Swiss-Prot record:
Multifunctional protein involved in endocytosis, multivesicular body biogenesis, membrane repair, cytokinesis, apoptosis and maintenance of tight junction integrity. Class E VPS protein involved in concentration and sorting of cargo proteins of the multivesicular body (MVB) for incorporation into intralumenal vesicles (ILVs) that are generated by invagination and scission from the limiting membrane of the endosome. Binds to the phospholipid lysobisphosphatidic acid (LBPA) which is abundant in MVBs internal membranes. (Microbial infection) Involved in HIV-1 virus budding. Can replace TSG101 it its role of supporting HIV-1 release; this function requires the interaction with CHMP4B. The ESCRT machinery also functions in topologically equivalent membrane fission events, such as enveloped virus budding (HIV-1 and other lentiviruses). GO terms for biological process: actomyosin contractile ring assembly; apoptotic process; bicellular tight junction assembly; extracellular exosome biogenesis; macroautophagy; maintenance of epithelial cell apical/basal polarity; midbody abscission; mitotic cytokinesis. GO terms for cellular component: actomyosin; bicellular tight junction; centrosome; cytosol; endoplasmic reticulum exit site; endosome; extracellular exosome; extracellular vesicle. This is Programmed cell death 6-interacting protein. Residues 417-697 are annotated as: Interaction with SDCBP. Residues 2-391 form the BRO1 domain. The chain holds residues 2 to 698 of 868 of the full protein. It is linked to Microcephaly 29, primary, autosomal recessive: A form of microcephaly, a disease defined as a head circumference more than 3 standard deviations below the age, sex and ethnically matched mean. Brain weight is markedly reduced and the cerebral cortex is disproportionately small. MCPH29 is characterized by small head circumference apparent at birth and associated with global developmental delay, impaired intellectual development, speech delay, and behavioral abnormalities. Affected individuals also have poor overall growth with short stature, mild dysmorphic facial features, and seizures. Keywords: Acetylation, Apoptosis, Cell cycle, Cell division, Cell junction, Cytoplasm, Cytoskeleton, Host-virus interaction, Intellectual disability, Methylation, Phosphoprotein, Primary microcephaly, Protein transport, Secreted, Tight junction, Transport. The keyword Cell division applies. The gene is PDCD6IP. The lineage of its organism: Eukaryota, Metazoa, Chordata, Craniata, Vertebrata. It is found in: Cytoplasm, Cytosol; Melanosome; Cytoplasm, Cytoskeleton, Microtubule organizing center, Centrosome; Secreted, Extracellular exosome.
Length: 697
């Protein structure tokens, strides 16, 4: 009639969606996006906690199921936000279950900043509820037993999973009730209490008097061990300690009494008495010493009668020796109970309310792959241009292929021709004058966007002050300058970004004016273009000697080598590999995920076929240019003049450069503008954001 149960644990209501949706700010940038679904569940969870653990609960089924379906959703959420828990602040407060424990340090209450602490307490409450549930139960009704036995067994395991989970998961030393020594003992009591029932069933189904003993015993030898585990340990609620003892004692008395029946059949009439006397003793004790905790009046008669009748028969019929209690065989032990492990889900009709959301050790390793992407792509690109620019630069510094397309001094060589052509219908000088004109304007455009937005902040702040420094303090909310912390932090940054950007274009403007004169030439039609280049008397060891023709095949191979770099720069840009599902598979399969081991070997697999192709380009050039530096050496003599060609030569060198400078300048300014235009828009956000914060006031 008297079963140990465990009172719940009280806890404070904390606003759940407040520090949870703010990470969904960090997550999705759009309203109307899935960001909507993850907040129609964020407040759905806040609803669950309040309904689950906000109250002393109505001992039922759902009351448990809720608590279970909460604990579920908890564990279901932690591999998604509190990994290192940087500042994500939802600190939990939990109150101890058995107040009088430690009167030294921290006692009745503990507020900790770790989810592992939170989940443990819920689970404690689950286990704590299951017990209360299993105790009310009618134990005569046979469907009643089943529910008791299931619940204890569950509570027992619910605790034992805490024991093995606390020290390893928190952030410091834990409160009295949830410490491995405490719970490990409760877990054992539940278990012993479960086992009690099986004795009680087995008893109802009038089973073998041997089997009832062995079952009864093993129950004793469980309460026994729960005593042993309290005896000199402060793990304690007050009335728990004598019950464990009284129970143990009853249990041990049944065990004796049934084994008495067995000994009787086997005609050991001594054993019978010896085992009963022991049994009778055991009860007498309990009758007096724990009377207020257990009623055993009936049982006591059953023994005394059985004893009486046995002592009657033996004294007058059988005359059998009675053994000292030490002389007897151990009653066996038969357990039928095990601690229901804790494997989520524990609730029935389950539904992971955040089933959609993507893990954090995925999200952070997925973004640390995207720099590994950019690094290798951008890095290979940068090796390309610097290789190409250098090459182009040597050619001109060596007058190539201008010198070899020079049949007669009369005409513009064909490369210069083919070049000039490109420069014209690409806009001409006109596209460069365009871009060089409009750029400081687009720079200015942004300076205005910025300072209107910072001025706004400086404007409001000034109003804030005059108000307090003149008011009866009806104005008593946040000092505005303290509120405009990070928006000025950006402000400073946006400035240093522009100061860098302004000076950056002056480097170009200076280059541009010391180069465009020669472009003026390129954009001219052949007539004047041909007329403006000083004509010279051509050297005639150019008819087709091996000194010259060899160079043409170098400048047709180096001609193609740099032409190939486009296709690469394109395929390097074009490739995107969706890494998500490869991490996702490796986190569900294995513990956590080490990204470097996987990404590196994936990259030199995805891109690997190009990195080698890239080093093939660069190192081939080092060859092709050296085998041109030493070859021009020889052509220098076989083609000569004094002053007639010294002009022609050192003009064409400057036009070759002129073209390069043009392409080097356009491709630079387009890529420049197509960056400051991207900034305008990033600053529109910022104009509106400051506006909305001076509207937030």
């Amino acid at each position: 009639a008297t079963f140990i149960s465990v009172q719940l644990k009280k806890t404070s209501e904390v606003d759940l969606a407040k520090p949870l949706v703010k990470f969904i700010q960090q997550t999705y940038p759009s309203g109307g996006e899935e960001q909507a679904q993850y907040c129609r569940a964020a407040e759905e969870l806040s609803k669950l906690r309040r309904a689950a653990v906000g109250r002393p609960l109505d001992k039922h089924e759902g009351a448990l199921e809720t608590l279970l379906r909460y604990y579920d959703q908890i564990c279901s959420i932690e591999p998604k936000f509190p990994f290192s828990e940087n500042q994500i602040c939802l600190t939990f407060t939990w109150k101890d279950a058995f107040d009088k424990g430690s009167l030294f340090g921290g006692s009745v209450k503990l507020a900790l900043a770790s989810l592992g602490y939170e989940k443990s307490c819920v689970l404690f409450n689950c286990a704590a509820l299951a017990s209360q549930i299993a105790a009310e139960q009618n134990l005569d009704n046979d469907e009643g037993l089943k529910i008791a036995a299931k619940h204890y067994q569950f509570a027992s395991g619910a605790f034992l999973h805490i024991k093995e989970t606390v020290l390893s998961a928190l952030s410091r030393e834990p409160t009295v009730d949830i410490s491995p020594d405490t719970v490990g003992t409760l877990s054992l009591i539940m278990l012993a209490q479960a086992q009690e029932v099986f004795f009680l069933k087995a008893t109802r189904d009038k089973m073998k008097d041997a089997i009832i003993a062995k079952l009864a015993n093993q129950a004793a030898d469980y309460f026994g061990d729960a005593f042993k585990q309290c005896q000199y340990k402060d793990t304690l609620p007050k009335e728990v300690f004598p019950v464990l003892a009284a129970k143990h004692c009853i249990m041990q008395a049944n065990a004796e009494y049934h084994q008495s029946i067995l000994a009787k059949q086997q005609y050991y009439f001594g054993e019978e008495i010896a085992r009963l006397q022991h049994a009778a003793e055991l009860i007498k004790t309990v009758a007096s010493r724990y009377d207020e905790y257990v009623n055993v009046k009936d049982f006591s008669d059953k023994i005394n009668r059985a004893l009486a009748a046995a002592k009657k028969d033996n004294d007058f019929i059988y005359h059998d020796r009675v053994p000292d209690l030490k002389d007897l065989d151990p009653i066996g032990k038969a357990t039928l109970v095990k601690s229901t492990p804790v494997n989520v889900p524990i609730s029935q009709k389950f539904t992971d309310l955040f089933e959609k959301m993507v893990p954090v050790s995925v999200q952070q390793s997925l973004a640390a792959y995207n720099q590994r992407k950019a690094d290798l792509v951008n890095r290979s690109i940068a090796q390309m241009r610097e290789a190409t620019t250098l090459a182009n630069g040597v050619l001109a510094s060596l007058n190539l292929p201008a010198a070899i397309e020079d049949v007669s001094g009369d005409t513009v060589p064909q490369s210069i021709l083919t070049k000039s052509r490109s420069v014209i219908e690409q806009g001409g000088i006109q596209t460069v004058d365009q871009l060089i004109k409009e750029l400081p304007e687009l720079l200015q455009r942004n300076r205005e966007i910025l300072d209107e937005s910072l001025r706004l902040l400086d404007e409001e702040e000034a109003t804030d002050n005059d108000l307090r420094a003149k008011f009866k303090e009806r104005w008593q909310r946040t000092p505005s300058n303290e509120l405009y912390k990070p928006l000025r932090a950006e402000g400073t940054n946006f400035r240093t970004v522009l100061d860098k950007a302004v000076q950056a274009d002056g480097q170009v403007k200076e280059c541009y004016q010391s180069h465009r004169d020669t472009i003026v030439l390129l954009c001219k039609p052949e007539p004047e273009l041909n007329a403006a280049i000083p004509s010279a008397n051509p050297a005639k060891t150019m008819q087709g000697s091996e000194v010259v023709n060899v160079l043409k095949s170098l400048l047709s191979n180096l001609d193609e080598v740099k032409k190939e770099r486009e296709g690469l720069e394109n395929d390097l840009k074009s490739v995107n590999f969706d890494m998500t599902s490869k991490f996702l598979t490796a986190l569900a399969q294995d513990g956590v995920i080490n990204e470097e081991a996987l990404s590196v070997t994936e990259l030199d697999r995805v891109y690997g076929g190009l990195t080698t192709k890239v080093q093939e380009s660069l190192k081939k050039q080092e060859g092709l240019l050296k085998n041109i530096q030493v070859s021009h050496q020889e052509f220098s003599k076989m083609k000569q003049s004094n002053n007639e060609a010294n002009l022609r030569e050192e003009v064409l060198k400057n036009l070759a450069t002129a073209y390069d400078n043009f392409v080097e300048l356009v491709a630079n300014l387009k890529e420049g503008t197509k960056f400051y235009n991207e900034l305008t828009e990033i600053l529109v956000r910022f104009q509106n954001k400051c506006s909305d914060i001076v509207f937030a006031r």
